Structure 1
Amino acid sequence: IVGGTASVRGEWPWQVTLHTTSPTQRHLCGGSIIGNQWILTAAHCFYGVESPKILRVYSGILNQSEIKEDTSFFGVQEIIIHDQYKMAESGYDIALLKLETTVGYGDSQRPICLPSKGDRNVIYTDCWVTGWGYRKLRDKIQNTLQKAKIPLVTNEECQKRYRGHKITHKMICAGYREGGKDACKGDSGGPLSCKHNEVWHLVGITSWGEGCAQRERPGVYTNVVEYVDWILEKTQAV
């Protein structure tokens, strides 16, 4: 996160850190708890990943230093990538992780509500991007979970900023015109959380952008409201 500030412990209890153990253990992506065995993240995170056996999901973490060999994690039973996904820049950048065990909800870890289908026509004014990603393009994974308040940008305005790309209604953009506060390397897959009527909703999934927090280059996020039916399909399967 560029221009972010340290989060407070328990502030974003749906935020998870997805680690890989291959070749060595490190933070790979962000993610969000959406159900007791479900993590919503970005499909592009799994480019290297041939097996869910190398993945570890850590919830209730503020600092990456809390993670050692003796730290409990959730194993991943299955990786479900949207079957229309080709690349982040073309959309469908959404994946689900089915966990091997159930997340026990508490003050450190709980799910975030998905947006309501009716609420597709609501103006979100209190949106925050969180993650352990870089603070600048040439940097490193941050110890403490960072947060940044970011304004949503209309599809029309986002399309003006990305000549040569196709910004679809399945994408949602966010960022200040002058730049400065945005997602960066390592924030991918994490949430874009917006508070509406005192309830937090998972409005976006950090997906892609041209550089980090550049002037007139908003962050591009998967528009979660456009995928509620797909998420229910995969999580409510009979």
Structure 2
Amino acid sequence: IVGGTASVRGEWPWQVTLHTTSPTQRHLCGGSIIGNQWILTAAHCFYGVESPKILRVYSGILNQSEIKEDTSFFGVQEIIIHDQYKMAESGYDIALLKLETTVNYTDSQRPISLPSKGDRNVIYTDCWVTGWGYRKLRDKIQNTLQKAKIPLVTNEECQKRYRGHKITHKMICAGYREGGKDACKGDSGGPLSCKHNEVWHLVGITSWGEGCAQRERPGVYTNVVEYVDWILEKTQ
């Protein structure tokens, strides 16, 4: 996260860090708890992944350094990638992880509600992007979970900034016109969480952008509301 600030323990209890264990254990992507056995994340996270056997899902994490041998985690049974997915820049950047066991909801690990299909056209004004991603393009994964409040940009304006792309209504953009606050490398798959009528909704999934936090180049997120039927069908 560029231009963000440190989160506090328990501030984003749906946030997970998805780790790969081969050849060594490392953070790969962010993700969101959406159900007792389900993580919502980006399809592009699995580009170098042939099987879910190398994945570990960690909930309740503040610092990456707090993850030790005895820290509990969840195994992944199945990776469900949207069948129309090809590359982040072309959309359908969404994946479900079915956990090997169910999550016991606590203060440290809770689900985030999906947006309501009736709220399809709401332009949310209290949106936050979170993750352990880079603070600038040439950096490293942050130890402490970062957060940044970012405004949503309309599809029409976002399409004007990304003229060499097709920005569909299945994408949602967020960023300041002057730049300065954005997701960056290591944040993908994580949530764009918006508080609407005192309820947090998973409005976006961190997907891609032209550089990080550049002026007139907002971050591009998978527009979760457009995938509610797909999520309900895949999770039964």
| Band of TM-score, shorter chain | over 0.9
Deviation at 1:65, TM superposition (A): 1.1
Deviations 1:172-229 (A, max 9, x none): 0000000000000000000000000000000000000000001010000000000000
**SS of aligned partner of 1:70:** coil
Query: How far apart are the structure 2 equivalents of 1:69 and 1:19?
Result: 13
Instruction: Quote the sequence identity (%).
Output: 99
Query: How far apart are the structure 1 equivalents of 2:68 and 2:48?
Result: 23
Deviation at 1:22, TM superposition (A): 1.3
Query: How far apart are the structure 2 equivalents of 1:94 and 1:11?
Result: 24
Query: How far apart are the structure 1 equivalents of 2:24 and 2:171?
Result: 33
Deviations 1:16-48 (A, max 9, x none): 000001121100000000000000000000000
Residue aligning to 2:7: 7
**SS of aligned partner of 1:118:** helix
Query: How far apart are the structure 2 equivalents of 1:218 and 1:194?
Result: 17
**Runs of 5+ in structure 1 lacking a partner?**
none
Deviation at 1:123, TM superposition (A): 2.2
**SS of aligned partner of 2:9:** coil
**SS of aligned partner of 2:120:** helix
Deviation at 1:156, TM superposition (A): 0.4
How much is the aligned-residue C-alpha RMSD, in angstroms?
Answer: 0.5
Following superposition of structure 1 onto structure 2, how do residues 144-223 of structure 1 map, counting pairs within 5 Å? Answer: 144-223=144-223
Deviation at 1:110, TM superposition (A): 0.1
Deviation at 1:163, TM superposition (A): 1.4
Query: How far apart are the structure 2 equivalents of 1:166 and 1:7?
Result: 34
| Runs of 4+ deviating beyond 3 Å | none
Deviations 1:123-174 (A, max 9, x none): 2000000000000000000010000000000000000101110101000000
Deviations 1:57-99 (A, max 9, x none): 0001111111112211100000000000000000000000000
Deviation at 1:104, TM superposition (A): 0.6
**SS of aligned partner of 1:121:** coil
Deviation at 1:121, TM superposition (A): 2.1
Residue aligning to 1:84: 84
TM-score (norm 2): 0.99
Following superposition of structure 1 onto structure 2, how do residues 1-238 of structure 1 map, counting pairs within 5 Å? Answer: 1-236=1-236
Deviation at 1:6, TM superposition (A): 0.2
Aligned pairs, how many? 236
**SS of aligned partner of 1:193:** strand
Query: How far apart are the structure 2 equivalents of 1:43 and 1:14?
Result: 18
TM-score (norm 1): 0.98
